[PDB]
């Protein structure tokens, strides 16, 4: 019965995917961003690792969170697909951007300057080809449904 609940709870949870950015050999390097789709918002859950790998606990913990509008969707897709070279998200508690990484083709960077009144907090995730295409597919999937093609 350990699996006899993955179709019950699945069909409730927000649709999402995560970018495995753990890093035991030193923390700060360790983190795990979760992108999701709630209502009509791009949810960005940034977590800073805490507990090492082989042990116990809760591993990561929420920190700064972004709630991007459905409009910003096809915007990011603009970048990922190779159109815009940048995208700016101006959330209240989190001003940021998303651009391409020059060190590697079809790989990108999501840098941020989350205002918290004072002082400002910096954080950033790097999407590798995989992680990068991943986000694209996700966002494609959103739009598709968001536009009502599932009826």
């Amino acid at each position: 019965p350990s699996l006899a609940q993955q179709r019950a709870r699945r069909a409730q949870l927000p649709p999402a995917f995560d970018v495995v950015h753990w890093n035991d050999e030193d923390i700060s390097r360790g983190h795990l961003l979760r992108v999701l789709h709630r209502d009509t918002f791009v949810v960005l859950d940034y977590h800073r690792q805490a507990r090492m790998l082989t042990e116990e606990g809760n591993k990561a913990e929420r920190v700064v969170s972004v709630m991007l509008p459905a409009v910003y969707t096809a915007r990011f897709l603009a970048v990922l697909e190779g159109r815009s070279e940048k995208v700016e998200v101006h959330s209240r508690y989190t001003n940021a951007t998303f651009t391409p990484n020059p060190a590697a083709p079809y790989t990108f960077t999501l840098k941020c300057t989350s205002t918290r009144p004072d002082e400002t907090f910096e954080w950033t995730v790097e999407f590798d080809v995989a992680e990068s295409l991943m986000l694209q597919r996700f966002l494609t999937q959103a739009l598709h449904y968001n536009t009502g093609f599932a009826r």
Partner: protein
């Protein structure tokens, strides 16, 4: 309600406001555009409509026509031309966006007129996806699995 996306443009000069829609019913890709009717609304509770529904440009595309369009978004062709009694339109990829121009007619009027619409930058992304999506669902599979 049908799958669709809109590009509302209201300007301080009503003689330029264009409500451009792009919806798809089954295998029917249907493009349209209603002209701005009156100055911009000002009272939040004035639900009166802002676009002239009796000046609407409604054109329809055949199941293949959709396909041809997608064929153009994906570069399997330089452009797609459709000549029909109701209109004459070309879909072509611009360097910075897309372009659907030609000559069509507004409702309840014989006078036809040159026309055109461009779905640039983020607009192309929406447009690209939407078409690729329609054609993808334009066979009746999902629904057939109920």
């Amino acid at each position: 309600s049908l799958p669709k996306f809109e590009i509302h443009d209201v300007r301080d000069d009503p003689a330029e406001g264009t409500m451009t829609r792009v919806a798809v019913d089954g295998k029917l890709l249907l493009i349209s555009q209603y002209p701005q009717l009156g100055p911009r609304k000002v009272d939040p509770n004035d639900l009166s409509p802002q676009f002239d529904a009796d000046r609407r440009i409604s054109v329809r595309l055949r199941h293949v026509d959709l396909a041809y369009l997608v064929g153009v978004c994906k570069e399997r062709v330089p452009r797609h031309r459709m000549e029909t009694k109701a209109y004459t339109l070309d879909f072509e990829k611009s360097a910075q966006g897309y372009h659907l121009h030609g000559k069509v007619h507004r409702v309840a009027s014989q006078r036809m007129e040159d026309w055109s619409v461009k779905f640039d930058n983020h607009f192309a992304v929406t447009l690209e996806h939407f078409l690729e999506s329609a054609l993808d669902e334009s066979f009746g599979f999902r629904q057939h699995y109920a």
